[PDB]
Design an enzyme around this catalytic site. Structure first.
Site, PDB file in Angstrom:
ATOM      1  N   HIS A  85      53.615  49.684   6.009  1.00 45.62           N
ATOM      2  CA  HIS A  85      53.017  49.056   7.192  1.00 45.62           C
ATOM      3  C   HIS A  85      54.071  48.139   7.820  1.00 45.62           C
ATOM      4  CE1 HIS A  85      51.660  45.819   4.367  1.00 45.62           C
ATOM      5  NE2 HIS A  85      51.518  44.993   5.422  1.00 45.62           N
ATOM      6  N   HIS A  87      54.475  44.848   8.361  1.00 43.14           N
ATOM      7  CA  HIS A  87      54.716  43.452   8.076  1.00 43.14           C
ATOM      8  C   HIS A  87      56.035  43.320   7.317  1.00 43.14           C
ATOM      9  CE1 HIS A  87      50.140  42.315   8.268  1.00 43.14           C
ATOM     10  NE2 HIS A  87      50.735  42.199   9.466  1.00 43.14           N
ATOM     11  N   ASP A  89      57.009  42.131   4.497  1.00 41.42           N
ATOM     12  CA  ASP A  89      57.208  42.499   3.105  1.00 41.42           C
ATOM     13  C   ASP A  89      57.481  43.994   2.933  1.00 41.42           C
ATOM     14  OD1 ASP A  89      54.459  42.874   3.712  1.00 41.42           O
ATOM     15  OD2 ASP A  89      53.957  42.813   1.596  1.00 41.42           O
ATOM     16  N   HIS A 150      44.110  46.735   5.417  1.00 44.82           N
ATOM     17  CA  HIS A 150      44.924  45.527   5.503  1.00 44.82           C
ATOM     18  C   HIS A 150      45.624  45.420   6.870  1.00 44.82           C
ATOM     19  CE1 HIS A 150      48.011  42.537   4.393  1.00 44.82           C
ATOM     20  NE2 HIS A 150      48.881  43.378   4.999  1.00 44.82           N
ATOM     21  N   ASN A 181      46.152  37.739   3.145  1.00 46.17           N
ATOM     22  CA  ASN A 181      46.288  37.574   4.576  1.00 46.17           C
ATOM     23  C   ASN A 181      45.543  38.726   5.237  1.00 46.17           C
ATOM     24  OD1 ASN A 181      47.234  36.781   7.225  1.00 46.17           O
ATOM     25  ND2 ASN A 181      48.704  38.467   7.061  1.00 46.17           N
TER      26      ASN A 181
HETATM   27 ZN   LIG Z   1      50.787  43.075   5.509  1.00 48.54          ZN
HETATM   28 ZN   LIG Z   2      52.048  43.191   1.043  1.00 48.59          ZN
END
Ligand SMILES: [Zn+2]
Ligand SMILES: [Zn+2]
Ligand SMILES: O=C(O)c1ccccc1CCn1c(-c2cccc(OCCN3CCOCC3)c2)n[nH]c1=S
Ligand SMILES: [Zn+2]
Length: 233
Positions: A85, A87, A89, A150, A181
């Site tokens: 995804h 983000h 990380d 998520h 989150n």
């Molecule tokens: Zn994420």
């Molecule tokens: Zn993550």
């Protein structure tokens, strides 16, 4: 095999590998936020004589260490990587991978969201994942878009040869009993998306969360329980 690495075993900026099955490893890294240190998992899947990487190790320094650790422990070239995804990380470190000659991939949905977010953008596009329940083969894995959870773009990865499902950040470890989150999450669709995963991979023997300890298919129901509890806050 043996004890799964925790933050205990991992100094700042270092990475540990963990063999889950023949030719399947997780990679474990750490990152600080808000004064706490968090672990983070990705996957490595042997692809003939080369390696497919799933996800960065959450930033440039950790990702450089991941490659050094692979080079040291496995000694096969990483030829391709997929970010599950948008983000940081999962895509933080993509430039590092690119500089080392890895072809970096993500769906058009992830690429677009990473761009909007000002995050690193994997170079190559994965076609055929835009509709919930879409699956595509990618070398030794299947990539699956279960629908929004998520994040709207999150992918899951299955290794049919070793029955390993990597849920990424759409799946929570058992120790996590409250939602992380969820700023970018679709809480309304998350359990339906989990249901798609359950229905598509009922044979999975190992389930790897985005963060923390592996388990079995019980992690899907666990995630559902946690997300529903948060929904009803
Ligand atoms: Zn994420
Ligand atoms: Zn993550
Ligand atoms: O939020 C989670 O589910 C979670 C659970 C365990 C450990 C860490 C996290 C958050 C990690 N994370 C992030 C992240 C976390 C901190 C910083 C960041 O970039 C800024 C991105 N994006 N997506 C995810 S998942
Ligand atoms: Zn290329």
């Amino acid at each position: 095999s043996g004890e799964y690495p925790t933050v205990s075993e991992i100094p700042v900026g270092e990475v540990r590998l963990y063999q889950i099955a023949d030719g399947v490893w997780s990679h474990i890294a750490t990152q600080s936020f808000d004064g706490a240190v968090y672990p983070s998992n990705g996957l490595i899947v042997r692809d003939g004589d080369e390696l497919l990487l799933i996800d960065t190790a959450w930033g440039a320094k950790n990702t450089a260490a991941l490659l050094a650790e692979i080079e040291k422990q496995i000694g096969l070239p990483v030829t391709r990587a997929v970010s599950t995804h948008f983000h940081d990380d999962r895509v933080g470190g993509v430039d590092v991978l690119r500089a080392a000659g890895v072809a970096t991939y993500a769906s058009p949905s992830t690429r677009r969201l990473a761009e909007v977010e000002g995050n690193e953008i994997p170079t190559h596009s994965l076609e055929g994942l835009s509709s919930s329940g879409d699956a595509v083969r990618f070398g030794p894995v299947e990539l699956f878009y279960p629908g929004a959870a998520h994040s709207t773009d999150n992918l899951v990865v299955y290794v049919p040869s070793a029955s390993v499902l990597y849920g990424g950040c759409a799946i929570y470890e058992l120790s996590r009993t409250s939602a992380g989150n969820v700023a970018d999450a679709d809480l309304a669709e998350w359990p339906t998306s989990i249901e798609r995963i359950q229905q598509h991979y009922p044979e999975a023997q190992f389930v790897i969360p985005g963060h923390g300890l592996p388990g079995g298919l019980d992690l899907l129901k666990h995630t559902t329980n946690v997300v529903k509890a948060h929904t009803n806050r």
